[PDB]
Design a protein around this ligand. Structure first.
Ligand SMILES: OC[C@H]1O[C@@H](S[C@H]2[C@H](O)[C@@H](O)[C@H](O[C@H]3[C@H](O)[C@@H](O)[C@H](S[C@H]4[C@H](O)[C@@H](O)[C@H](O[C@H]5[C@H](O)[C@@H](O)[C@H](S)O[C@@H]5CO)O[C@@H]4CO)O[C@@H]3CO)O[C@@H]2CO)[C@H](O)[C@@H](O)[C@@H]1O
Lengths: 207, 207
């Protein structure tokens, strides 16, 4: 629609395949990825607003799409830190830094959300990650007896809250376009889970 | 207190031995105990200020001493809910309600404090309870590399803080008389402790 490009500089790097901030591991080594500067990451006042998104990136030599897996701490506004397999498609690596133009695009994925329930989660406190989302997840709310509680998004790309209640958790998710989709996670453990675990989801953002 | 005085009324209950609000379990069955009204409980605006304290209660037929283990939710100022073994000593069991006078007194205990580390406590969040204190515990601080941090006392008789750091924990406790002692508590887990545990203390409030 109204869908502005973002101008900035790209560098390249080899981290982000493992141990990146957004806790999105494992990353296939053939995957084209990127680290994003803090200002653009936390769009809308949401920590990790753009975590797990995909960007289309024009360099002086071509255009390419990258999965956003990590924070680029020392990056200026507009700055991306690309994997070299991605970088090489849009610029010469002889130059260390290239002019780029990027925007958020729809993820080249299929199927539904997958939920990751962080280690330490319970009815008392929980951090919930959304994976496999066609668009940036701006918001996640759960219903506790009648009303909708907003969950804060963290730097580690999980939505977080307390006293969530017993019983299965009905949730809703909003994307960067304002689209909202509803789902249901199975009831949380009474005592904090020693291991993080996976819940296959039943919904996806609209095309 | 060395001196103190409340006027109120007492009834009696069979609860507070297991599952009380102050989480002081286990409670020996033959121990004289009481539940406490919210107003006196939260003395000086500290939630559960008088939890785990001891009171001398005077009834129409004698005096006796009790351990405070539970909240008396429907209590007016000065109202107490005694265990029968305590009630039996200062009143007639044929009454459902008696006139009483009471005061916070020195604990008929020996030895130092012990600490309870609540399940789910870690470097990031801890709930720490003091047991075996001769007087009410009004304040608990810990030292976080520079200066002292105040821990919120909770309705459930643990002091709570966050981002406490790694290593062993330098604490100072303050009683209702204004008296301050200092102790150290072992290292806090990197991730949330699966079960609650007790650690021995090495300090005690002045007689
Ligand atoms: O912060 C950056 C860092 O974070 C970590 S993950 C870590 C979080 O940081 C931390 O904030 C969080 O702390 C939780 C804690 O895990 C949770 O277990 C407790 S729940 C507690 C509850 O507050 C309390 O109401 C309750 O008391 C009950 C009692 O159980 C009962 O007996 C009676 S019937 O009623 C009482 C009162 O209602 O007891 C429960 C449990 O003891 O709360 C805090 C905060 O909400 O936990 C996270 C991990 O464990 C992350 O890994 C890093 O990447 C980040 O950099």
């Amino acid at each position: 629609a109204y869908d502005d490009l973002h101008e900035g500089y790209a560098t390249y790097t080899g981290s982000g395949y493992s141990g990146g901030a957004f806790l999105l591991d494992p990353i296939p080594s053939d995957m084209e990825i990127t680290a994003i500067n803090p200002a653009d990451l936390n769009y809308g006042g949401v920590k990790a607003a753009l975590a797990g998104s995909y960007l289309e990136v024009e360099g002086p030599k071509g255009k390419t799409t990258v999965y956003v897996t990590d924070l680029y701490p020392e990056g200026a506004r507009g700055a991306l830190d690309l994997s070299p397999n991605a970088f090489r498609k849009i610029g010469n690596m002889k130059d260390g830094k290239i002019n780029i133009k990027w925007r958020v695009v729809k993820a080249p994925i299929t199927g539904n959300f997958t939920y990751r329930i962080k280690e330490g989660s319970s009815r008392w406190w929980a951090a919930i990650q959304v994976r496999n989302h066609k668009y940036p997840v701006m918001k996640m709310e759960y219903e506790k007896d009648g009303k909708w509680i907003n969950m804060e998004k963290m730097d580690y790309n999980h939505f977080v809250s307390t006293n969530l209640g017993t019983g299965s958790l009905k949730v809703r998710m909003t994307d960067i376009r304002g689209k909202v989709v509803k789902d249901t996670i199975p009831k949380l453990p009474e005592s904090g889970t020693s291991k993080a675990y996976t819940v296959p989801g039943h919904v996806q953002f609209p095309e």
